[PDB]
């Protein structure tokens, strides 16, 4: 049993650029059998280089492989427009076909400011049993953001939780929204409502809050 | 050039027995090993087993005491049956030759969960003062508490399609999964114009025309 | 205080097993009993069975060696399963509390009956020479032979509001239902404007705008 | 199994009229455990009468029970417009749970005429292969109506089914309708067609007919 | 005058059994023979077995070792169970009598095929000069590839049902069907009126409207 | 197993004209134990003669049927309009029954002439991998309608289907579409696409060709 272990799965870069991936292999890979797959979204993985150094037939010449021993690199010399997917490291020297945690590419942008807002539980909500509070975040590039919901002004750890979109096939930005699944005994029972947000595109963190009963 | 085709059973309940089959068109069929490849989220592609038209099989210790795995020469068709399946063998599982190198399936989607088809309960999501940031808007309409996977959401019958955001569907602590869609509009669009959200469920057959109320 | 969501396969056919569930939320779920109540038309209320968190089951001597129930104490969620069922079983299923004394669920409509899903076929009502008694006459258009319970009837789209009759749905001795719709209007009337009935059936994706001729 | 039985449900109380119901039992109910359940349409049943003789909290005083050992009787002193619904009686000192059959209270008026009205069946039901012939009674407030189809000059029964409209909102009246479903071969032979309609809002009975060949 | 009503699994997948009821309405039920019919395309009628009440079964020598018949006495009820179904299945299965000389079934489509359901694609077709006879020409929009049967193709929202003539699905040998419609329409109510290609595949759920124009 | 077999395959007489169908057997039927069905579009059969010489109940006088032996002959005297659908014939006298191949009746009327309309390949779909090539006939009577297509004034066969709509219940005639699927190479270098098409409306066959590059 391998283990093998890739970079950081959220490397980013401009179209146009060269890309290092690297698959630090557990134990030393006999004959250095490693391949370096790819899998585009909704498809199944495609080989590119077999052998760690040679590419498959009806591959292009800008995937290069390279390394030994336990430290394999793949390169990309031009990040085309169609290569922007998840990439994995198999090896098959051993009986057990291992495969690595695999990195994604995406495209890097110049950084954004999220689009803050929040919205109160519906009333049929509300009488459904549960009330939902959810703030969104819009158009932001850097995929990293912390959203810390505040209610009565106190901090609210794992009763939350949130999913983000997928990378915009048009401008190349990410969405979040956060929501806060509360009862409605516990949600009658406090006064105020806010989620924090913290993003590099806003030195000052920016918060926004409601308060129940009035619109 | 084979063409391998999946198919089986999606859904599935807890302590149920999976069983996928793959079938095998192109060229020769004997003298290759056929080998099952599960990639889940969270964890990566993992590698199950092998079997050859003799019946010899290769297994993954981890999943040893789970795998089981048949040959049909007669029609070109292998199948897996993993025993005993919980909550994480939810995963894509996929049909390719002996090391997957260089043809594959097309992947099968198999989910195990405890639950009965439900409709979904869309609910308005209000554009408050603060949503009002002179120009920009925030609307949507949170559909929650549905069991099947696939629903899908629009705005006007299709009519609006830029700013719209649809969320993935997450899985709450209740065996159903819930969903949000969203779009950002002018308040001049808001207070000339009506905005429905179609959010349909085929499982169910249940299409709601949900308005927002500002 | 509790509120209970209720969800179920509410379309069945004859010898399937009925799967009922409900949900409790607001107050705890342990330390109670949990009640499954049946209102068929023509007969009255029955009590089916209950059940706790810990699996302790009461059965109505009636309906005995059919019922069985389960109980999910993690989601908080109790569930029923009424075997091999017949079409005696057309009635609306209620979870409620210990005798439901407090709280009540809202209700399943569960149909069972052996038709495969069919369109309305509407028919022009002309109105004859006698029932246009000078000043007063009766238009409508008959609906027949469809399945699925629910069929809502309009007319002009919503302009003629006065005077609609909308009979309750009947099931003839084929398995298949027939409703009526009627509206009173003027005799000279019949000349000036155009009436016409938008019928439409959601289970069979169908919306008629058949006009009624003299 | 207690078996529990109640009034005729078709008692008919003018609004702001004291209204009395009975729940007979078939034996004797333990401890006096009877309860009372008001069921609007469209909704599930609620309390009214817990013990026989208290009424629940939450509810108006205008609810009186009373009776015990194996009759017992429900009393409303003031018919308000939010009181005509199904009452049903519940028995729960024994092991199964058993429900009355339910009356039901609705407006009483003044007596109206049923307004007439019959319709032939049309040309593609008849090239469909059915024929369906329909006569309809509007604004008639007893609920009893005796429409009988008679062709010629023949006893026809069982061979035609009805529709009873619910209360009215505005001026609490029905409408009947009911249909004569035929075969083509016994449509084509026969040459009148009629249903008589007997009312006790008037005094001698009516019938309205129609003979196939002439419009 | 017995009512025969049947009901099964529209849809199989290869190596997988197929099931079929058919109920039994009016008359008496014992002291008969009741047959299961299958009519495939190409081929003609043919005649699956028998089976009455006390469960003598009878049975074709072709379909002799795959087919199963069941009956349940209780309900007025009998089952066909065929083993294994390849894609030579594809036929309409019918309930009678031991002839099929009084009373049929209604006609229940069952289809054999290893492939999932896709969303249609539809390709523009623009008319050619050549096509173009001065005032003579065809246009339309090809749909590939789809994989369950049911699909329609409207002009204009029904605005335009004059000269449209709707092709039959093809099943190519990926397992997915292919339709082709077209309309004859004038050059200059072409150039004038602009025709759009509806389509609205209901197990995708998928409304492309496509115009194709010279 | 008696292979039963009808001679006429597609019978085609203007409506009001005599009709004979011919059911040959295989064997010789135990006691002119056969019978004919007919099966209106959309419906399941239904019998028309019993014993191949007497008539079902409800059958109208107009068909008539005879033969013996190996011989059967079904004779409809007047063609109805509704009369022109598939008609099967059923054997009894061996233990499996079996039914005939089918045969189908249609509307006559003069011999109209195919419009011949060609279309090329699309550029999405030329992009797609898939060269599709269509070529339509529109509103021609006799069934019988051949599509040979060829490729660089070359002859290929098998890589294209057919698909006929059913016949039109204003004009009584019929469109016939043909589908040539090629490859990506194969339709680049390939320079004259045309399909062939003979038929007895025109005594010289007609060929409308396009070429690639240009419209």
């Known amino acids: 049993e391998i283990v093998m272990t890739q970079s950081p799965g959220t490397l980013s870069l401009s179209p146009g650029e060269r890309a290092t991936l690297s698959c630090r292999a557990s134990?030393?890979?006999?004959?250095?059998?490693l391949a370096w797959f790819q899998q585009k979204p909704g498809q199944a993985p495609r080989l590119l280089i077999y052998?760690?150094?040679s590419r498959a037939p009806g591959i292009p010449d800008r995937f290069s492989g390279s390394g030994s021993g336990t430290d394999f690199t793949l390169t990309i010399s031009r990040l085309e427009p169609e290569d922007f997917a998840v990439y994995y490291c198999?090896?098959?020297?051993?009986?057990?076909?291992?495969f690595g945690g695999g990195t994604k590419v995406d495209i890097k942008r110049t950084v954004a400011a999220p689009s803050v807002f929040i919205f109160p539980p519906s009333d049929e909500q509300l009488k459904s049993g549960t009330a939902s509070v959810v703030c969104l975040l819009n158009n932001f590039y850097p995929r990293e953001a912390k959203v810390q919901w505040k209610v009565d002004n106190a901090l609210q750890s794992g009763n939350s939780q949130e999913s983000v979109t997928e990378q915009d096939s048009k401008d190349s930005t990410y969405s979040l929204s956060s929501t806060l699944t509360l009862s409605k005994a516990d949600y009658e029972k406090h006064k105020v409502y806010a989620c924090e947000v913290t993003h590099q595109g806003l030195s000052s963190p920016v918060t926004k809050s409601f308060n129940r009963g009035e619109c | 050039e084979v063409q391998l085709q999946q198919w089986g059973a999606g859904l599935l309940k807890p302590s149920e027995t999976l069983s996928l089959t793959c079938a095998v068109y192109?060229?020769?069929?004997?003298?290759?090993?056929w080998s099952w490849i599960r990639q889940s989220p969270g964890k990566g592609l993992e590698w199950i087993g092998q079997?050859?038209?003799?019946?010899?099989?290769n297994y993954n210790p981890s999943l040893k005491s789970r795998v089981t795995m048949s040959v049909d020469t007669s029609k070109n068709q292998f199948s897996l049956k993993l025993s005993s399946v919980t909550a994480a063998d939810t995963a894509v599982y996929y049909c390719?030759?002996?090391?997957?190198?260089?043809?594959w399936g097309q992947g099968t989607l198999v989910t195990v969960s405890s639950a009965s088809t439900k409709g979904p309960s869309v609910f308005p999501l209000a554009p408050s003062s603060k949503s009002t940031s002179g120009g920009t808007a925030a609307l949507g309409c949170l559909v929650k508490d549905y069991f099947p996977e696939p629903v899908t959401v629009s705005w006007n019958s299709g009519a609006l399609t830029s700013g719209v955001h649809t969320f993935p569907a997450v899985l709450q602590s209740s065996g159903l999964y819930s969903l949000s869609s969203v779009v950002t509009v002018p308040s001049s669009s808001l207070g000339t114009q009506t905005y429905i959200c179609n959010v349909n469920h085929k499982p169910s057959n249940t299409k709601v025309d949900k308005k927002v109320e500002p | 205080e509790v509120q209970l969501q209720q969800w179920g396969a509410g379309l069945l056919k004859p010898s399937e097993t009925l799967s009922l569930t409900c949900?409790?939320?607001?107050?705890?779920?342990?330390?109670?009993?949990?009640?499954?109540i049946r209102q068929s038309p023509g007969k009255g209320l029955e009590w089916?069975?209950?059940?706790?968190?810990?699996?302790?089951?009461?059965?109505?001597p009636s309906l005995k060696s059919r019922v069985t129930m389960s109980v999910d104490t993690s989601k908080n969620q109790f569930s029923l399963k009424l075997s091999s069922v017949t079409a005696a079983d057309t009635a609306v299923?209620?979870?409620?509390?210990?005798?439901?004394?407090?709280?009540?669920?809202?209700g399943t409509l569960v149909t069972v009956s052996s038709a495969s899903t069919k369109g309305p076929s509407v028919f022009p009502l002309a109105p004859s020479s006698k029932s246009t008694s000078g000043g007063t006459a009766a238009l409508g258009c008959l609906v027949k032979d469809y399945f699925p319970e629910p069929v809502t009837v309009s007319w002009n789209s919503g302009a003629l509001t006065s005077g609609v009759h909308t009979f309750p749905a009947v099931l003839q001795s084929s398995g298949l239902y027939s409703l009526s719709s009627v509206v009173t209007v003027p005799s000279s009337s019949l000349g000036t404007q155009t009436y016409i009935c938008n019928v439409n059936h959601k289970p069979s994706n169908t919306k008629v705008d058949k006009k009624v001729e003299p | 199994e207690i078996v529990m039985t109640q009034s005729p449900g078709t008692l008919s109380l003018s609004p702001g009229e004291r209204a009395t119901l009975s729940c007979?039992?078939?034996?004797?109910?333990?401890?006096?455990?009877?309860?009372?359940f008001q069921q609007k349409p469209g909704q599930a049943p609620r309390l009214?009468?817990?013990?026989?003789?208290?009424?629940?909290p939450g509810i108006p005083d205008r609810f009186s029970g009373s009776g015990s050992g194996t009759d017992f009787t429900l009393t409303i002193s003031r018919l308000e417009p939010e009181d005509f619904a199904v009452?049903?009686?519940?028995?729960?000192?024994?092991?199964?749970?058993?429900?009355?059959?339910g009356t039901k209270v609705d407006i009483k008026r003044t007596v109206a005429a049923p307004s007439v009205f019959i319709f032939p069946p049309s040309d593609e039901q008849l090239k469909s292969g059915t024929a369906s012939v329909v006569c309809l009674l509007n604004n008639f407030y007893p609920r009893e109506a005796k429409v009988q189809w008679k062709v010629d000059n023949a006893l026809q029964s069982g061979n035609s089914q009805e529709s009873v409209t619910e209360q009215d909102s505005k001026d609490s009246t029905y409408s009947l309708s009911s249909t004569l479903t035929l075969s083509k071969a016994d449509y084509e032979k026969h040459k009148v067609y009629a249903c008589e309609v007997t009312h006790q809002g008037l005094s001698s009975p009516v019938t309205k007919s129609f003979n196939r060949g002439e419009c | 005058e017995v009512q025969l009503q049947q009901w099964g699994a529209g849809l199989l997948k290869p190596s997988e059994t197929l099931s079929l009821t058919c109920?039994?309405?009016?008359?008496?039920?014992?002291?008969?023979?009741?047959?299961?019919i299958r009519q495939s395309p190409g081929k003609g009628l043919e005649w699956?077995?028998?089976?009455?009440?006390?469960?003598?079964?009878?049975?074709?020598p072709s379909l002799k070792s795959r087919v199963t018949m069941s009956v349940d006495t209780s309900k007025n009820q009998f089952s066909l169970k065929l083993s294994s179904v390849t894609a030579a299945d594809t036929a309409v299965?019918?309930?009678?009598?031991?002839?099929?000389?009084?009373?049929?079934?209604?006609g229940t489509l069952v289809t054999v095929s290893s492939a999932s359901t896709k969303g249609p694609s539809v390709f523009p077709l623009a008319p050619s000069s050549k096509s173009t006879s001065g005032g003579t020409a065809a246009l339309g929009c090809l749909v590939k590839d789809y994989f369950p049967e049911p699909v329609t193709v409207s002009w204009n929202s029904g605005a335009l049902t004059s000269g449209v003539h709707t092709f039959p699905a093809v099943l190519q040998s990926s397992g997915l069907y292919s339709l082709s419609s077209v309309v004859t329409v004038p050059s200059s109510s072409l150039g004038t009126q602009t025709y759009i290609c509806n389509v609205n595949h209901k197990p995708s759920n998928t409304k492309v409207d496509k115009k194709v124009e010279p | 197993e008696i292979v039963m077999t009808q001679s006429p395959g597609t019978l085609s007489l203007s409506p009001g004209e005599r009709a004979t169908l011919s059911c040959?057997?295989?064997?010789?039927?135990?006691?002119?134990?056969?019978?004919?069905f007919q099966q209106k579009p959309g419906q399941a059969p239904r019998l028309?003669?019993?014993?191949?010489?007497?008539?079902?109940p409800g059958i109208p006088d107009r068909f008539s049927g005879s033969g013996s032996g190996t011989d059967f002959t079904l004779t409809i005297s007047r063609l109805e309009p509704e009369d022109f659908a598939v008609?099967?014939?059923?054997?009894?006298?061996?233990?499996?029954?079996?039914?005939?191949?089918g045969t189908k009746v249609d509307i006559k009327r003069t011999v109209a002439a195919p419009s011949v309309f060609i279309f090329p390949p699309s550029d999405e779909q030329l992009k797609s991998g898939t060269a599709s090539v269509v070529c339509l006939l529109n509103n021609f009577y006799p069934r019988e309608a051949k599509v040979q297509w060829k490729v660089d004034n070359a002859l290929q066969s098998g890589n294209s289907q057919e698909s006929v709509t059913e016949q039109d219940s204003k004009d009584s005639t019929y469109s016939l579409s043909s589908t040539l699927t090629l490859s990506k190479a194969d339709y680049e270098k390939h320079k004259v696409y045309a399909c062939e098409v003979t038929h007895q409306g025109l005594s010289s066959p007609v060929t409308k060709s396009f070429n690639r590059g240009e419209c």
């Open positions: 198999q090896q098959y020297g051993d009986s057990p076909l291992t």
């Open positions: 052998g760690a150094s």
């Open positions: 192109g060229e020769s069929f004997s003298g290759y090993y």
């Open positions: 079997i050859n038209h003799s019946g010899n099989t």
């Open positions: 390719a030759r002996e090391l997957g190198h260089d043809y």
């Open positions: 134990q030393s890979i006999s004959s250095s059998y």
